[PDB]
Amino acid sequence: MVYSYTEKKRIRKDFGKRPQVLDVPYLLSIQLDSFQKFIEQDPEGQYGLEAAFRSVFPIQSYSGNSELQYVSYRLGEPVFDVQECQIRGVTYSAPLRVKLRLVIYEREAPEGTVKDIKEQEVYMGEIPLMTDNGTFVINGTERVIVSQLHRSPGVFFDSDKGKTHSSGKVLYNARIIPYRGSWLDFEFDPKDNLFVRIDRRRKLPATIILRALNYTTEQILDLFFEKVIFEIRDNKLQMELVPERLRGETASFDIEANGKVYVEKGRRITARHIRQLEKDDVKLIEVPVEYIAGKVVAKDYIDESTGELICAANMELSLDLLAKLSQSGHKRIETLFTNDLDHGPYISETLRVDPTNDRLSALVEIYRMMRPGEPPTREAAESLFENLFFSEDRYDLSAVGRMKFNRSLLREEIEGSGILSKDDIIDVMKKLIDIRNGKGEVDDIDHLGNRRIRSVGEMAENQFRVGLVRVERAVKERLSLGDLDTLMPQDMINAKPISAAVKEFFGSSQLSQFMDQNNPLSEITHKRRISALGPGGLTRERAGFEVRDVHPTHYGRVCPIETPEGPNIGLINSLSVYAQTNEYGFLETPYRKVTDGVVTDEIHYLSAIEEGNYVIAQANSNLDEEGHFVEDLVTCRSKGESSLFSRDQVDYMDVSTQQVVSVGASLIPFLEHDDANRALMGANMQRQAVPTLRADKPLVGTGMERAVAVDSGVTAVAKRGGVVQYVDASRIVIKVNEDEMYPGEAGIDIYNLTKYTRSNQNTCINQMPCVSLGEPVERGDVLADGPSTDLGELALGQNMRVAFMPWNGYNFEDSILVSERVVQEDRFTTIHIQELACVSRDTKLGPEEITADIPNVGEAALSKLDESGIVYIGAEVTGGDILVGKVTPKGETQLTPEEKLLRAIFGEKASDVKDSSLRVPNGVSGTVIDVQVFTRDGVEKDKRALEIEEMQLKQAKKDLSEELQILEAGLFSRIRAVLVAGGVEAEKLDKLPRDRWLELGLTDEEKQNQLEQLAEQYDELKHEFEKKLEAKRRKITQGDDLAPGVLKIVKVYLAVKRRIQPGDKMAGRHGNKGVISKINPIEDMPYDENGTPVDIVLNPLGVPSRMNIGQILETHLGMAAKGIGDKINAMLKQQQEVAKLREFIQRAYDLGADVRQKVDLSTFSDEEVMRLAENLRKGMPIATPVFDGAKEAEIKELLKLGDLPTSGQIRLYDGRTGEQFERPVTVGYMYMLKLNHLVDDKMHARSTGSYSLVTQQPLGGKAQFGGQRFGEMEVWALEAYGAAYTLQEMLTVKSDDVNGRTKMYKNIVDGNHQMEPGMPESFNVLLKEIRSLGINIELED
């Protein structure tokens, strides 16, 4: 039994066969957790400000015996609030201050300090504080930073083969990507040669790095290569062979294994021969001599007598070499194997290519490649090389990079340094060689286990560290200079650089941007968006065909559907419902553990790596009561290959069908009946919705709408409240019960609604109350309803009656016919708020004042303007009427007898000012909602600016006096209680306080003393109230600061009511959209048998071409709900008994298969019955899961109870000819929504306006009455038509030909219709530009 006091008013019917196990999470933890942990005081330094400090904080002078340290950082409290910052337009940030410590040591003492300055902290800027809704108030405006997805730092063994080779061969390169520092990569040549490349520059020899890494040739050869003994003594030439160690190479001749011949001459080696030569112990066997020649010597040797470099390394053996080396050097020689069948040198080939064999010679080459000039001096090259990769302070990639490194190298250890190591590169090269020879599988860039996301916390920390190191450099400079001083710790500590850097990172960034405020769903999914571009990932939308392809590992991590259809397709994705971030950078997917068939309810989060190991079943499976399965074989995925498996093979279980779906797609019913593309466009355009005046609850639901509305933070919810005392249109106060009440507080919770506020999309946001009065409200219950919301459910759109029938071509392809009733019903009516602002801009000639004394204007225009020049609140305006009368002072003139005479006649103007008043742009009409004025301190004109301050102060005193009154009432009740039984009737206390007769002495020992104590309690409370009101007043009228050029700022907001009309972009929820083409009257449209006409006529041919069965299902459920609502409304009209309606609605609820158990008359009392019915008196709220919705038969019985035909087709009669139609038409009630693409905004045209200074062309894209632009492809089409005169008209009359435009205008006025070409000024500009170069050009005759 569910109470759901806030929801018990109206309960939506669900149809979920599977039972809910895990609830939907807060769905916004990712946005807030990163910020919280970044600003969190952690006991250990692992991230956030702590690690950013401990990175490079200790500052030491250049042998100055001085040091700089800190204790801890303290964040200052915000000066203003969210609403305060919004109104002021300031950025909501947080001050920061850290206690420091400067310690100096005198000379001639090892670490012997003499003084400390660990007594003064310093201040460093403000950190932009993040809101309660995962947002920021930067410059008053609200913006969202989208999380960035990129490849995790680590090593990548990529093939990079195919057609890109252009040689019919495969490639094998390795790439390492540090989180910071240069990029070191190694490419493979088609000549079987590796090459070192850094930062995509000129390649380098593979082995030059090893020589630079103090490695001799013999060391490298003995390490990477295996050497056979080659023990040839007394010219026996007897070779040690292990057939198991190496085999597969045919034997030519003279082959024996332990005496008798085991492998015949000219016969291929066989596994039998290998087996017998391994089983039979084989010693050094005489071989033919040519085997020496092909083999290469391992190490550079010397003769026994003389130490020459005879038989130097990387040299094949020679027969003439052979005898002399045998007689001089030795008899047994280290050599190689070079089993090209399974191996390949690939380095010994490159070894001879290397021109430098000394470490110094190799070290100069890398510096030369880095620096083309300024050759090193045995000091620059080594320092540069060490700082390049072996530097902790300059490479320092990450711990996650080391973890990925070890994981790729199968190392149990996961903790390492940020620097590299020689053995690391050695094993990387060896692994590359093994892979090239064949040892395993290649990596996968698109695999989600190889790519990680980034949150705002990590990037904020990176920005802070970048700003911090720059300042620390100057700090070290100032410590090394003039160190002999005991000044305060502010010698080089500047907050300006760090503050500017953090502001720029927050302010202007590719990832930083405003959110779409039109829809709460749009906001919440915008905060759940994921990208790959920006400072990393992908630099541009180009260079990718499969990167945007759907990897199989996107199963339960991101939505495979929610993505834009623009050129950024496949680059922006939304998280799944239950997706959670990994510890470092990845995503985790919860799953239910399956043990020996039964499924354990415990959840486990898995990555792309773990998921590919175990066995995970599909949610579309039958479960027994005990956790067993109806069928032994169930389809499961192991390594991306779904197939049936026995119940003993499954290892894990899904959570829900929505685990693969994002929030936006989850809200569309019957996804399994609609095309993927259709769902894609529907979800995309759903974000483009706009709320109307009356938000209407959808009748068909998915359940997640309630969670979306509550977690959106757009409405008001109840926190620790017990009962509502007073309700206002914008003010809400709830009295919490003593159970959830802690002492020391009054015990009242006030909430003020948002009323008609402009959004980032210039829309209107308003929060409507829900409860009536005196209603016991529980914690977590919604209190108000914002835009596109209804009773805690996101209600964006209206449920409109529709039909699928071609009506005279008005639904030809994508044209939508609308009802005059809807216009009369005012459905889809939109309200838009526009902002206009003005500034004074004090000049050299003088200040600019707003005194409403505008010359050369009539009093009629001035009628609507107030004394200071503003328009009265609530007034209406059309066209270009003046808003605020501002004037610009003019420089004085001489005596000017004409001007002197005019002033002696007219005066009060003397041409001292110019009309700089503020007026409406043309083609704009509306009314003013409110005005705002901002004046900087130091100027106190304030003609009528006191009114808004007075209103604010009245609001503050009103909502501050209430808690004081409540506490006073409690204290006075206490004092009335204490005078009881003291001989004092309550009548005296009721008449006057009198301080209870000023301690008359009811007890004379405690009554006097308790009365006194409570008297100072009252006095202290009075003082606290006075202090609070004074402080708030100071915070209100303190004034603001503006730009230095600006003097004062005035802002005005206006309301516009836009009504539906032909040309509006109208759409549904199934990837279906249309345009309004006609407002048909009600009478023309067809009507049913009962005379109720349809509302919307829609084309029935769209579905077959686009697979939109979900639309028809929506129609059938619409009839179900409409029949139920009409029946219950009729029952209500009849004024029947409670029991009949109760049993009727219980029947309406308990029906269907086993989905959910809920019964009335046990939880809901009588007094809830009529209100619950009146809630759902116009329809049945029905919820349908994403992939567990109702069935066709089910909706058939639904329609049966509705007294409706199961077919869904109903006869209609023409509204025009009054004739019955054959082929009865299915009708529908569609939860249709209006989009932002409204015709009044697209309304644009021009005849002739101002032109550009350059090229003398008209403005363009509607920028102050612009004009449309022509194109080259258009004139190609025109030339194919070949209307040359039209082309000349375009090029001359409507173009930059200044002398031609006026001529043509005068001709048209005179009706001449003659065209005078002239010659375009753009050509003149081109000619001048060519002549600006040293180029001769001229036009001949």
Partner 1 sequence: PDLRPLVPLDGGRFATSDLNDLYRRVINRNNRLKRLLDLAAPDIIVRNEKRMLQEAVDALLDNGRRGRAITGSNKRPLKSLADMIKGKQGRFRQNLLGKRVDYSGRSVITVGPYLRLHQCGLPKKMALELFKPFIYGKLELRGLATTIKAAKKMVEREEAVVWDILDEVIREHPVLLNRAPTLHRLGIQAFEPVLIEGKAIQLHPLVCAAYNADFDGDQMAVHVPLTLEAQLEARALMMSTNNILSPANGEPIIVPSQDVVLGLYYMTRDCVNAKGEGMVLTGPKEAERLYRSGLASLHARVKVRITEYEKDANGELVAKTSLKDTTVGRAILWMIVPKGLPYSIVNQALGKKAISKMLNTCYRILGLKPTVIFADQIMYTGFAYAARSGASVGIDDMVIPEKKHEIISEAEAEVAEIQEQFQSGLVTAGERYNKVIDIWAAANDRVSKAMMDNLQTETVINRDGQEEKQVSFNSIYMMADSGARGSAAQIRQLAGMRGLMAKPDGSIIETPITANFREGLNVLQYFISTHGARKGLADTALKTANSGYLTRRLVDVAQDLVVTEDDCGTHEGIMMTPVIEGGDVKEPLR
Partner 2 sequence: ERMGHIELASPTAHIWFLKSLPSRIGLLLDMPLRDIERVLYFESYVVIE
Partner 3 sequence: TTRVLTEAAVAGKRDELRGLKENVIVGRLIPAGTGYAYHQDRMRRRAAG
Contact set for partner 2, span 1322-1341 (CB under 8 A): 1324, 1328, 1331-1332, 1334
State in angstroms the smallest separation of the CB of 1326 from partner 2.
12
Instruction: For residues 784 and 801, give the distance between their C-alpha atoms in angstroms, rounded to a whole number.
Output: 29
The verdict on 1326 binding partner 1 (CB under 8 A) reads: yes
Q: Indicate which single residue of 369, 888, 1224, 1319 sits in contact with partner 1 (rule: CB under 8 A).
A: 1224
Q: Angle 423-425-426 (CA atoms, 0-180°, nearest 5)?
A: 60
| Residue 928: φ, ψ to 5° | -80, 135
Ranges within 802-831 binding partner 1 (CB under 8 A): 804-810, 812-815
1331 contact, one of partner 3, partner 1, partner 2, none, CB 5-8 Å limit per kind: partner 2
Task: Judge contact between 1248 and 1304, C-beta under 8 A.
Answer: no
Tell whether residue 1309 is a contact of partner 1 (CB under 8 A). yes
Residues 6+ apart with CB under 8 A from 493: 122, 124, 471, 475
CB neighbourhood size of 1145 (10 A):
21
Nearer to partner 2, 1092 or 1324 (CB): 1324
Please write down the HEC assignment for all residues of 244-259: CCCCCCCCCCCCCCCC
Shortest reach from residue 569's CB to partner 1, in Å: 6
The interface with partner 2 within residues 975-1014 (CB under 8 A) comprises: none
Which residues are near partner 3 by CB under 8 A? 1275, 1279, 1281-1285, 1287-1288, 1291-1292, 1317, 1319-1320, 1323, 1335-1336, 1340
Least Cβ distance, residue 1298 to partner 2 (angstroms) = 13
Which residue lies nearer to partner 3 by CB, 590 or 1320?
1320
Which run of H or of E encompasses 512? strand 512-514
**How many residues belong to the site for partner 2 (CB under 8 A)?**
5
Which partner from the list partner 1, partner 2, partner 3, none does 1336 bind, CB cut-off 5 to 8 Å by kind?
partner 3
Q: What is the 3-state secondary structure (H, E, C) of 1036-1104?
A: HHCCECCCCCCCEEEEEEEEEEECCCCCCEEECCCCCEEEEEEEECCCCCCECCCCCECCEEECCCHHH
Residue 1282 CB, nearest approach to partner 3 (Å)? 2
| Least CB distance to partner 1 at residue 683 (A) | 13
Contact track, partner 1, 525-554, x by CB under 8 A: --------------------xx-xxx-x--
Distance CA 793, CA 9 (A): 13
Q: Which of residues 1265-1324 bind partner 2 (CB under 8 A)?
A: 1324
Cβ at position 1268, least distance to partner 3 in Å: 20
Partner in contact with 742, chosen from partner 2, partner 1, partner 3, none, beta carbon below 5 to 8 Å by kind: none
190: CB partners within 8 A, 6+ apart: 165, 167, 169, 171
Per CB under 8 A, contacts with partner 1 among 228-287 are none
- Among 470, 1175, 1240, 1319, which residue interacts with partner 1 (rule: CB under 8 A)? 1240
Query: Scanning residues 475 to 534, which ones bind partner 2 (CB under 8 A)?
Result: none
- Applying the rule CB under 8 A, the residues between 381 and 410 that interact with partner 1 are none
**How far is Cα of residue 847 from the mean position of the Cα atoms in its chain?**
45
User: C-beta of 1333: minimal distance to partner 2 in Å?
Assistant: 8
Euclidean distance between CA atoms 92 and 830, whole angstroms: 31
| CB-nearer residue toward partner 2: 938 or 1334 | 1334
- Listed residue (614, 1064, 451) closest to 816, CA to CA: 1064
Beta strands 1048-1058 and 652-653, pairing class: unpaired
Note whether 763 and 1241 are within 8 A (CB): no
Please choose, out of 212-220, 481-489, 926-934, 1095-1103, the segment that lies near partner 1 by the rule CB under 8 A: 1095-1103
Residue 105 binds which entry of partner 3, partner 1, partner 2, none, CB below 5-8 Å type-dependent: none
User: Closer CB to partner 2, residue 36 or residue 1324?
Assistant: 1324
Partnered with residue 113 across adjacent β-strands are 105
Other beta carbons less than 10 A from residue 917's beta carbon: 20
Taking CA atoms, 103 is separated from 70, 201, 480, 491, 1114, in Å, by 11, 46, 14, 14, 75
Site size toward partner 1 (CB under 8 A) is: 138
Return the number of the residue (373 or 1261) whose C-beta is nearest partner 2.
373
The answer to whether 235 and 327 are in contact (CB under 8 A) is no
> At which residue do the structure tokens 């108000």 appear?
784
The secondary structure of 523-585 as a DSSP string is: HHHHHTEEE-BSSSSBSSS-S-SSTTS--GGGTTTB-SS---SSTTTTT-EEB-SS-EE-SSS
Q: 1296 touches which of partner 1, partner 3, partner 2, none (CB within 5 to 8 A by kind)?
A: partner 1
Which one among 1243, 1299, 1302, 1317 touches partner 1, defined by CB under 8 A? Answer: 1243
Residue 568: phi, psi to the nearest 5?
A: -85, 20
**Interaction partner, residue 1073 (partner 3, partner 2, partner 1, none; CB < 5-8 Å by kind):** partner 1
Partner whose binding site includes residue 1292, from partner 1, partner 3, partner 2, none (CB under 5 to 8 Å by kind): partner 3
Residue number with CB closer to partner 2 (1133 or 1328): 1328
How far is CA 501 from each of CA 37, 124, 744, 981, rounded to the nearest angstrom? Answer: 21, 12, 43, 71
631 lies in the site for partner 1, by CB under 8 A: no
- State which of positions 195-224 bind partner 1 (CB under 8 A): none
- Work out which of 1242, 1250, 1264, 1298 binds partner 1, going by CB under 8 A: 1242
Interface residues for partner 1 in 660-679 (CB under 8 A)? 660, 670-677
Q: Which of residues 649-668 bind partner 2 (CB under 8 A)?
A: none
Of the two residues 372 and 1271, which places its CB atom closer to partner 3 in the complex?
1271
1106 by DSSP, 3-state: which? Answer: helix
Report helix, strand or coil for 1275: helix
| CA of residue 34 relative to chain centroid, distance | 13
Question: Using the rule CB under 8 A, is 371 a contact of partner 2?
Answer: no
The binder of 1112, among partner 3, partner 1, partner 2, none, by C-beta within 5 to 8 A per type, is: partner 1
User: 1247 touches which of partner 1, partner 2, partner 3, none (CB within 5 to 8 A by kind)?
Assistant: partner 1
Q: Which residues bind partner 2 (CB under 8 A)?
A: 1324, 1328, 1331-1332, 1334
